[PDB]
Ligand binder design. Structure first.
Ligand SMILES: *[C@@H]1O[C@H](CO)[C@@H](O[C@@H]2O[C@H](CO)[C@@H](O)[C@H](O)[C@H]2NC(C)=O)[C@H](O)[C@H]1NC(C)=O
Ligand SMILES: *[C@@H]1O[C@H](CO)[C@@H](O[C@@H]2O[C@H](CO)[C@@H](O)[C@H](O)[C@H]2NC(C)=O)[C@H](O)[C@H]1NC(C)=O
Ligand SMILES: *[C@@H]1O[C@H](CO)[C@@H](O[C@@H]2O[C@H](CO)[C@@H](O)[C@H](O)[C@H]2NC(C)=O)[C@H](O)[C@H]1NC(C)=O
Ligand SMILES: *[C@@H]1O[C@H](CO)[C@@H](O[C@@H]2O[C@H](CO)[C@@H](O)[C@H](O)[C@H]2NC(C)=O)[C@H](O)[C@H]1NC(C)=O
Ligand SMILES: *[C@@H]1O[C@H](CO)[C@@H](O[C@@H]2O[C@H](CO)[C@@H](O)[C@H](O)[C@H]2NC(C)=O)[C@H](O)[C@H]1NC(C)=O
Ligand SMILES: *[C@@H]1O[C@H](CO)[C@@H](O[C@@H]2O[C@H](CO)[C@@H](O)[C@H](O)[C@H]2NC(C)=O)[C@H](O)[C@H]1NC(C)=O
Lengths: 50, 170, 98, 50
C-alpha cells in the first residue's frame, strides 16, 4: 500500500500562434451510457401494529 | 452527550442505535460536498498551459491569468476575492481538493478557452487565433464578422476598460 | 444543441432503455480526429477590395489557398460565389494578398 | 434519582442533536441544488456559446 499525492492529469502546451490553425481530417462515432433513478419502493406503515 | 462518564454511557446504551444513523447522515453530507466540488470543477482531461508570448489581438488578460510571482499562483482577481471575504466532541474535516488544485483547474480551463475556443470541450483542443474566435462568436449572434474585423481596436479598448472597471468596483 | 447536456461531443441522437427503478440513455455522438496544421488569414485583398468567406475559413498547405468548412477538411478553390466583399483592404489586421 | 436527572439531560441533548442534524440535511440539499446549477452554467456558457 502506497500513499501519494493525486495528479490532476497530464499536461500539454497547445501550439498557439497568430496565423495558424488545426483542422480535423477524420471522425469517429461514440456511444455512451448514463443512468438515472426515477422511482423508489412504495411503503406503508400502520401505527397500532407497530 | 455523556462527556466521558460510565453511568451516562450505560444509560445511553438502552436507547438502541440513535447514533449510527446520525454519523451515517453526516458522512453522506461530507461525501456529497466532495462530489459537488469535483463535478463542478473537474471537466478537462488535460492541464493546458498558455504560451509564453501573449498577443491576443490587443485583448489584455493579464488581470485574470495566474501570477507566477505569488506562491499561490493565483490571479489578481482571485487574490482580491480571497482577501475580501472573511472542541467538545466535534471536528472539521479538510476538503479533498486543496486550493492550489482548484486554481490549477481554473487556469487550465481559461488557457484552453483562450487558445482553442470551444473545440477543447468536445474532442482535442485545436488552436486558432483569438480574433477569428471573436469573428465566429459574432457570427453566432447574427452579426457578420465584417463588423468585428472593421472595429477591432475599439472592441479591444472597450473590453479592457470594462475589465478595469470591474476590477476597481470589486 | 445545448453543449454537454447529453453525451460528450456533438450530439446526434439518443435511445432509452428500461431499468428496474430508473432509465438508461445511450447517446450517439460525433468526435473529430486526425487534425492537421495549417496557415490562416482572416480576409483576402483582391483588386483593392476585401473578401470574407460566406461560410468556412481560409487555409493553405503552403501555397494556393483554399476555403474549408470548420469541422472537416475539404478544400475548395476560392470563388466569388462563396465569398463576399466589404470595403477595401486598409483596416483589417492580417490581410494576405491572393 | 441521579438516573432520572441524567435521563432528562440525555433526552434534552439528544433532541438538540437531532434538530441540528435535520437542519444540516436541509441546508445540504439546498447547496446541492445550487452546485448543480453552477455545473450546468459552467458547462453551457464556458465550454460553448449559449
Ligand atoms: C503543429 O505545429 C507545431 C509547431 O511546430 C508542432 O510542434 C508542436 O509544438 C508545440 C508547441 O511548442 C509542442 O508542445 C509540441 O510538443 C510540438 N510537437 C512536436 C514537437 O511533435 C505540432 O506538432 C504541429 N501539429 C499539431 C497537431 O499541433
Ligand atoms: C478514418 O478512420 C477510419 C477508422 O480508423 C479509417 O478506416 C480504416 O481504414 C483502414 C485503411 O484503409 C482500413 O484498413 C480499416 O479497415 C478501416 N476501418 C474500418 C472500421 O473500416 C479511415 O481510413 C480513416 N480515414 C481517413 C481519411 O483517414
Ligand atoms: C494589461 O493591463 C495591465 C494593467 O494592470 C498592464 O500593466 C500595467 O502596465 C503599465 C504600462 O507598462 C504599467 O505602468 C503598470 O504598472 C502595469 N500595471 C501592473 C499592475 O503591472 C499591462 O501592461 C497590460 N498589457 C499590455 C500588453 O499592455
Ligand atoms: C497544396 O495542394 C495543392 C492542391 O492539390 C497542390 O497543387 C497540386 O499538387 C499536385 C501534386 O503535387 C500537382 O500535380 C498539381 O499540378 C498541383 N496543382 C497546381 C495547380 O499546381 C500543391 O502542390 C500542394 N502544395 C504543397 C506544398 O503540398
Ligand atoms: C503575427 O505574429 C508575427 C510574429 O511572427 C508578426 O510578425 C512580425 O511583424 C512585425 C511587423 O511587420 C515585424 O516587424 C516582425 O519582424 C514580424 N516578426 C517575425 C518573426 O517575422 C505579425 O505582425 C503578427 N500579426 C499578423 C501576422 O497579423
Ligand atoms: C497586394 O498587392 C498590392 C498591390 O501590388 C500590394 O501593395 C503594394 O505594396 C508596396 C509595398 O508597400 C507598395 O510599394 C505598392 O505601391 C503597393 N501597391 C498598391 C497599393 O497598389 C500589397 O503589398 C499586396 N499584399 C501584401 C500582403 O503584400
Amino acid at each position: 500500500i502506497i500513499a501519494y499525492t493525486m495528479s490532476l492529469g497530464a499536461e500539454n502546451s497547445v501550439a498557439y500562434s497568430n496565423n495558424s490553425i488545426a483542422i480535423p481530417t477524420n471522425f469517429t462515432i461514440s456511444v455512451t451510457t448514463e443512468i438515472l433513478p426515477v422511482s423508489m419502493t412504495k411503503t406503508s406503515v400502520d401505527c397500532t401494529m407497530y | 452527550i455523556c462527556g466521558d462518564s460510565t453511568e451516562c454511557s450505560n444509560l445511553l446504551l438502552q436507547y438502541g442505535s440513535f447514533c449510527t444513523q446520525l454519523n451515517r447522515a453526516l458522512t453522506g453530507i461530507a461525501v456529497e460536498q466532495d462530489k459537488n466540488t469535483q463535478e463542478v470543477f473537474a471537466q478537462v482531461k488535460q492541464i493546458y498551459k498558455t504560451p509564453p508570448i501573449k498577443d491576443f489581438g490587443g485583448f489584455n488578460f493579464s488581470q485574470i491569468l495566474p501570477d507566477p510571482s505569488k506562491p499561490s499562483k493565483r490571479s489578481f482577481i482571485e487574490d482580491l476575492l480571497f482577501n475580501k471575504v472573511t472542541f467538545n466532541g466535534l471536528t472539521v474535516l479538510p476538503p479533498l481538493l486543496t486550493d492550489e488544485m482548484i486554481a490549477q483547474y481554473t487556469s487550465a480551463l481559461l488557457a484552453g478557452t483562450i487558445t482553442s475556443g470551444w473545440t477543447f470541450g468536445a474532442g482535442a483542443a485545436l488552436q486558432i487565433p483569438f480574433a477569428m474566435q471573436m469573428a465566429y462568436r459574432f457570427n453566432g449572434i447574427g452579426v457578420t464578422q465584417n463588423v468585428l474585423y472593421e472595429n477591432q481596436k475599439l472592441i479591444a479598448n472597450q473590453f479592457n476598460s470594462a475589465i478595469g472597471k470591474i476590477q476597481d468596483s470589486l | 444543441k445545448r453543449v454537454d447536456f447529453c453525451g460528450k461531443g456533438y450530439h446526434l441522437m439518443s435511445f432509452p432503455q428500461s431499468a428496474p427503478h430508473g432509465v438508461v440513455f445511450l447517446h450517439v455522438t460525433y468526435v473529430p480526429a486526425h487534425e492537421k496544421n495549417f496557415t490562416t488569414a482572416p480576409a483576402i485583398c483582391h483588386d483593392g477590395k476585401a473578401h470574407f468567406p460566406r461560410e468556412g475559413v481560409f487555409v493553405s498547405n503552403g501555397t494556393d489557398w483554399f476555403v474549408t468548412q470548420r469541422n472537416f477538411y475539404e478544400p475548395q478553390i476560392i470563388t466569388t460565389d462563396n465569398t463576399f466583399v466589404s470595403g477595401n483592404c486598409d483596416v483589417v489586421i492580417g490581410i494576405v494578398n491572393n | 434519582e441521579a438516573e432520572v436527572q441524567i435521563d432528562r439531560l440525555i433526552t434534552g441533548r439528544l433532541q438538540s442533536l437531532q434538530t441540528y442534524v435535520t437542519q444540516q440535511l436541509i441546508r445540504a440539499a439546498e447547496i446541492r441544488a445550487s452546485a448543480n446549477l453552477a455545473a450546468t452554467k459552467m458547462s453551457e456558457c464556458v465550454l460553448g456559446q449559449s
